[PDB]
Structure formats: structure tokens, C-alpha cells
Amino acid sequence: GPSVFLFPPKPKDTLMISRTPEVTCVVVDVSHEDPEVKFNWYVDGVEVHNAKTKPREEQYNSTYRVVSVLTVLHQDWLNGKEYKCKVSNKALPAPIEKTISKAKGQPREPQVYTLPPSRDELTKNQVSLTCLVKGFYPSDIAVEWESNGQPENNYKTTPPVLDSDGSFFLYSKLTVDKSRWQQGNVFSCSVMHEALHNHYTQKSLSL
Amino acid sequence: GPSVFLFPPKPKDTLMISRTPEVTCVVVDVSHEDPEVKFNWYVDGVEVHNAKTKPREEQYNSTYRVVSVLTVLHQDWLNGKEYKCKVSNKALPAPIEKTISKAKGQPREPQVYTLPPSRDELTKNQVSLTCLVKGFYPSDIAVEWESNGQPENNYKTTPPVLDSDGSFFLYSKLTVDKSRWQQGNVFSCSVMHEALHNHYTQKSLSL
Ligand SMILES: *[C@@H]1O[C@H](CO[C@@H]2O[C@@H](C)[C@@H](O)[C@@H](O)[C@@H]2O)[C@@H](O[C@@H]2O[C@H](CO)[C@@H](O[C@@H]3O[C@H](CO[C@H]4O[C@H](CO)[C@@H](O)[C@H](O)[C@@H]4O[C@@H]4O[C@H](CO)[C@@H](O)[C@H](O)[C@H]4NC(C)=O)[C@@H](O)[C@H](O[C@H]4O[C@H](CO)[C@@H](O)[C@H](O)[C@@H]4O[C@@H]4O[C@H](CO)[C@@H](O)[C@H](O)[C@H]4NC(C)=O)[C@@H]3O)[C@H](O)[C@H]2NC(C)=O)[C@H](O)[C@H]1NC(C)=O
Ligand SMILES: *[C@@H]1O[C@H](CO[C@@H]2O[C@@H](C)[C@@H](O)[C@@H](O)[C@@H]2O)[C@@H](O[C@@H]2O[C@H](CO)[C@@H](O[C@@H]3O[C@H](CO[C@H]4O[C@H](CO)[C@@H](O)[C@H](O)[C@@H]4O[C@@H]4O[C@H](CO)[C@@H](O)[C@H](O)[C@H]4NC(C)=O)[C@@H](O)[C@H](O[C@H]4O[C@H](CO)[C@@H](O)[C@H](O)[C@@H]4O)[C@@H]3O)[C@H](O)[C@H]2NC(C)=O)[C@H](O)[C@H]1NC(C)=O
Numbered sequence: 265g266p267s268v269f270l271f272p273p274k275p276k277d278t279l280m281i282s283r284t285p286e287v288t289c290v291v292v293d294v295s296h297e298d299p300e301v302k303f304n305w306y307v308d309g310v311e312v313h314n315a316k317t318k319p320r321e322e323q324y325n326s327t328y329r330v331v332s333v334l335t336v337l338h339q340d341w342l343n344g345k346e347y348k349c350k351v352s353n354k355a356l357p358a359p360i361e362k363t364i365s366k367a368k369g370q371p372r373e374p375q376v377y378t379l380p381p382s383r384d385e386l387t388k389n390q391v392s393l394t395c396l397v398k399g400f401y402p403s404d405i406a407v408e409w410e411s412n413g414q415p416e417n418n419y420k421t422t423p424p425v426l427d428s429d430g431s432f433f434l435y436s437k438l439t440v441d442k443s444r445w446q447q448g449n450v451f452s453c454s455v456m457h458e459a460l461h462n463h464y465t466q467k468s469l470s471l
Numbered sequence: 472g473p474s475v476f477l478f479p480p481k482p483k484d485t486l487m488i489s490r491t492p493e494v495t496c497v498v499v500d501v502s503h504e505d506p507e508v509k510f511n512w513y514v515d516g517v518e519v520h521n522a523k524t525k526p527r528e529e530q531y532n533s534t535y536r537v538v539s540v541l542t543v544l545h546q547d548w549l550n551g552k553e554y555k556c557k558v559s560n561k562a563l564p565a566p567i568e569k570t571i572s573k574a575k576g577q578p579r580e581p582q583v584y585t586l587p588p589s590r591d592e593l594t595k596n597q598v599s600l601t602c603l604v605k606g607f608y609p610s611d612i613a614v615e616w617e618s619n620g621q622p623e624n625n626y627k628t629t630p631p632v633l634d635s636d637g638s639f640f641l642y643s644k645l646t647v648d649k650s651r652w653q654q655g656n657v658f659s660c661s662v663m664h665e666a667l668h669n670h671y672t673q674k675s676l677s678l
């Protein structure tokens with residue numbers, strides 16, 4: 265029979281008020297003999313009817329996949345409200361309820377430290393600009409780089425690593441042409457996190 | 472029926488000649504009614520006879536657990552030889568075979584860069600010393616810190632992260648009390664990887 269997977273909003277969407285966070289209920293292995301699926305959405309046990317449900321899309325494995333999308337209020341997600349998708353279908357003798365919420369825990373403010381390339385790396389044509397982000401909790405975070413206000417996306421960020429004090433840390437590595445660094449261009453690490461003031465901080469880095 | 476699990480040597484064991492790398496073949500869910508277990512080992516399909524098999528040990532669930540350990544040669548493992556454990560037991564319709572070997576792929580040599588704390592961190596009781604290891608392949612690697620002849624305790628290392636060129640990088644973060652950093656103590660990141668000369672390199676930093 266069908267199975268259901270419930271997905272949280274992207275952290276950046278929940279932290280920046282202009283963006284649009286969504287909880288997504290995904291139903292897979294919907295059969296052709298019983299293809300009708302009903303969604304019921306609940307926020308802290310209270311039914312809500314503003315979800316937008318997409319039409320069944322057939323998969324290459326001859327099963328249907330039907331998706332319902334619930335737009336959420338930033339502050340509801342951040343305050344730990346619970347989001348329940350209930351999925352009814354004639355092949356389910358009982359519906360499937362999945363419930364999700366923001367990761368729990370006392371929030372801790374990330375400290376953001378930018379680190380220039382090592383001297384040893386200056387023999388290479390590209391150098392590594394490092395953004396250390398430590399002391400944060402919970403682990404939901406967004407880390408981006410830019411220069412002159414424009415995205416610098418040739419970077420890679422480690423997963424959050426649990427540190428010895430219960431907090432998380434990560435590193436972000438931006439790779440740039442050495443000529444850009446030694447000519448004094450300014451790069452900046454931007455970090456978004458619920459424990460930050462206005463959910464946003466930016467640290468710069470230059471020669 | 473019995474099930475078999477085959478574990479590889481630790482990367483560091485294969486890289487330092489002082490150590491003794493081993494492949495371990497564990498058999499669980501061995502019954503009282505059919506308790507005899509026979510191991511046969513093969514390297515590249517050629518039977519070898521120098522494994523050390525321990526006598527069975529009954530578990531709290533009233534099944535036996537049986538372990539056989541094959542010492543491997545460092546160069547055999549690094550040269551990609553295949554280690555097959557075959558397990559026979561009369562409760563099996565056929566012997567179970569497990570095979571393992573080293574991660575495949577063109578080796579690429581890590582570059583190792585130490586980075587001091589951000590000046591912004593010098594207001595904290597503790598500071599973060601960072602070890603960047605980039606450009607290595609495969610991902611099997613060991614990273615340690617030491618100072619004054621003794622390993623450091625309070626470090627954490629990220630998982631390998633796939634970089635944009637197909638190689639991996641990681642960061643290791645050593646946290647030291649600020650007094651120790653300000654007193655000029657030298658801290659050292661040691662990296663062990665098959666693509667390094669002598670499978671080892673070290674970088675050090677001080678105030
Ligand atoms: C009866 O009891 C025995 C003994 O258990 C002990 O006693 C009982 C009474 C309880 O009190 C227990 O709490 C107590 O531990 C039970 O035996 C267990 O059986 C299960 C399977 O049913 C085995 O599970 C496997 O575990 C391995 C990892 O095992 C390591 O890590 C464990 C801690 O996480 C540790 O306990 C183990 O000892 C072992 O530790 C390692 O040991 C080696 C050798 O000494 C050492 O070098 C390592 O350093 C050490 N590591 C440590 C300590 O961290 C895990 O790999 C298995 O997962 C694979 O298989 C699953 C299918 O079972 C599958 O779902 C997974 O996805 C995964 O699949 C694998 O995936 C990889 C890559 O994805 C792929 O390459 C593989 O091919 C693939 N394999 C597949 C698909 O088969 C698995 O979870 C326990 O290890 C074993 N316990 C012991 C101590 O041996 C027994 O089950 C009980 N019977 C009943 C009926 O209850
Ligand atoms: C029929 O086909 C269905 C569709 O599969 C797709 O199409 C077919 C034709 C093949 O080509 C597939 O390879 C292809 O993917 C199958 O549906 C899949 O079912 C399995 C369960 O059987 C689902 O596995 C579950 O995956 C969860 C995570 O899923 C996210 O990440 C996937 C990438 O790894 C991605 O493919 C998914 O789309 C989903 O991605 C997220 O989507 C949301 C919605 O928009 C986004 O907002 C997110 O950003 C996306 N995140 C990304 C991309 O990272 C797991 O969490 C889950 O694990 C949990 O439960 C299991 C129990 O099953 C535990 O064991 C586990 O430990 C954990 O607790 C589980 O693994 C899979 O997601 C389904 N795929 C899709 C696309 O819906 C059918 O299974 C298949 N039927 C058959 C073969 O009979």
C-alpha cells in the first residue's frame with residue numbers, strides 16, 4: 265500500500281521573512297486501481313484547508329506519486345508548532361498520519377569567524393577562504409558567501425558536527441583565484457540561524 | 472538462519488607499519504541445534520590459512536556469535552586485494568560469502584593547511600585551531616592533533632566532504648584554552664593518507 269513522507273521547510277525560508285516556507289506531504293506507491301488520495305492538514309491539532317495539492321504524477325515504476333504543499337507562518341514553525349499530514353486512500357484500511365516540527369532544543373547563538381588562506385596555500389592558483397561557524401543549536405542553518413553583494417557560489421560547507429559541549433559547528437570553504445585575494449577584494453560569509461539577532465549575521469574577509 | 476558481517480581494517484592500521492590491520496568476519500544467529508561454524512578465507516580468490524578463529528560465545532538471546540580474524544598485509548590492502556570470508560553451517564542451504572576491499576579510485580594527495588584563530592575569537596576563554604585537509608582521494612583518512620609529545624583531547628573533525636573537482640576535503644578543529652595559545656605552545660595536525668609520502672604529513676602552528 266501507499267507510504268507517506270513529510271518534509272520540513274528549508275531553514276533559510278523559515279528565517280527570512282520575505283521567503284516562503286512550506287511543509288510538503290509526499291505520497292508514493294499510489295496504485296492505479298485505487299488512485300484517489302485525500303489530504304487533511306493540521307497545525308497543533310487544528311485542521312487547516314489552505315494546502316495546495318498537486319495532480320498525480322506517474323512514476324516509471326507504474327505507481328502514482330501525489331504531493332500536497334502547506335505554506336506555513338515563519339513564526340509558527342520557529343515556535344515549535346506541529347504539522348500533521350493525514351493521507352486517506354481506498355488502499356489504506358486506516359489513513360497515514362505523519363507529524364513534523366522544528367528541531368527542539370535550547371537555541372544557542374552561532375559565533376562566526378572568517379579565516380584567511382594559510383601562507384602555504386599562496387603557492388597555488390586558487391586559495392581557500394574559511395568561515396568557521398560554531399556554538400550553535402539547533403543545527404538548522406544556512407551559510408552563504410558573497411563579494412560586492414553578489415553570490416560567490418564556488419564553495420562547499422561541511423555538515424554540522426556535534427561539538428564537545430552539545431553545540432554544533434561547521435566550516436564553509438570558498439575557493440577563489442589567488443589574484444582576487446591578493447588584490448584585496450572583500451569576501452563575506454553570511455550565516456542565518458534562529459538564535460542570531462534578526463536571524464542573520466555577516467563577517468567579511470580580505471587581505 | 473545465521474548471518475555474516477565482514478569488517479575492514481581501520482585506515483590508520485593499513486597506513487602505519489607499526490600497526491596490525493585485520494579483516495574481521497563475524498557470524499551471528501548461530502543455533503544450538505547446528506552450532507558448528509567453518510571459515511574459509513581467500514585473498515584474490517586464493518585460499519589462505521593463517522586466520523585466527525575464536526571459539527563460539529553464547530549471547531543473551533541464546534544464539535552463538537563466532538568471530539574469525541584475518542591479519543592482512545598493509546601493501547596487500549593498499550594494492551586493492553579482495554578479502555573473502557566464506558562461512559559454512561548446517562542451518563544454511565549454501566555457504567555465505569562476504570567480500571571486502573579498499574575504496575577504489577585514483578589516489579590524490581591531500582594538502583594540509585593550519586589556520587590560527589580569528590582575532591575575534593581572542594576574547595573567548597578558548598580558541599579554535601583549524602586544520603584544513605583538501606584534495607585527497609579516496610576518503611579514507613586519519614587526522615590527529617598533538618602538542619609537546621602528547622595527543623590533544625578536545626578536537627573534532629568533520630566528515631570528508633566531496634569537493635567540486637571530485638576530491639574530498641575536511642576540517643579538524645582543535646579547541647585549546649586561550650592561555651595555552653598566548654603562551655606560544657606549538658600545536659600540530661598530523662594527517663595519514665595513502666597518497667602521502669610515507670602515508671603521513673604534519674603541519675604545526677603557534678602564536
Ligand atoms: C543475538 O545477539 C547478537 C549479539 O548481540 C549482542 O547481544 C545481544 C543479546 C544484545 O544484548 C545486543 O545488544 C548485543 O550487541 C546479535 O548480533 C547482532 O546482529 C546484528 C544483525 O541482526 C548485527 O547488526 C549489524 O551491525 C553492523 C555493525 O556492527 C558493528 O557495530 C555495532 C555497533 O553499531 C557493534 O555492536 C558490532 O559489534 C560491530 O562492531 C564492530 O566490530 C568490528 C569487529 O570486531 C570492529 O572492527 C568494529 O570497529 C566495530 N564497530 C563498532 C564497535 O562501532 C552493521 O554494519 C550491519 O548493518 C548492515 O546490515 C544491515 C542488515 O543487518 C543493514 O540493514 C544495514 O543497512 C547494513 O547494510 C550494509 O550496508 C553497507 C553499506 O551501506 C554494505 O557495505 C553492506 O554490504 C550491507 N550489509 C547488508 C545489507 O547485509 C548490522 O546492523 C550486529 O552487529 C550483531 N551484534 C554483534 C555484537 O555481533 C543478534 O542479532 C541477536 N539475534 C537476535 C535474533 O536478536
Ligand atoms: C516507486 O518510485 C517512487 C519514486 O522513486 C523515484 O522514481 C522511481 C521511478 C525511481 O527512479 C526512484 O529512484 C526515484 O527516486 C519511490 O518513492 C520513493 O520511496 C522511498 C521509500 O520506498 C522513499 O524513501 C524515503 O526517502 C526519504 C528522503 O526522501 C527525500 O530525499 C530523496 C533523495 O535521497 C528524494 O528522492 C526524495 O524526493 C525526498 O527529497 C525531498 O523532497 C522534498 C519534497 O519536495 C524536498 O522538499 C526536499 O528538499 C527533498 N530532499 C532531498 C532531495 O534531499 C527518507 O527520509 C526515508 O527514510 C526514512 O524512512 C525509512 C523507511 O522507509 C527509514 O528506513 C529511514 O531510516 C528514514 O527513517 C525513505 O528512505 C523515497 O523518498 C521515495 N522517492 C520519491 C521521489 O518520492 C517508490 O518507493 C517506488 N516504489 C517501488 C519501488 O515499489
Ligand SMILES: [Cl-]
Pocket residue numbers: 280281282283
Ligand atoms: Cl529577508
Ligand SMILES: [K+]
Pocket residue numbers: 277283284285286
Ligand atoms: K520556498
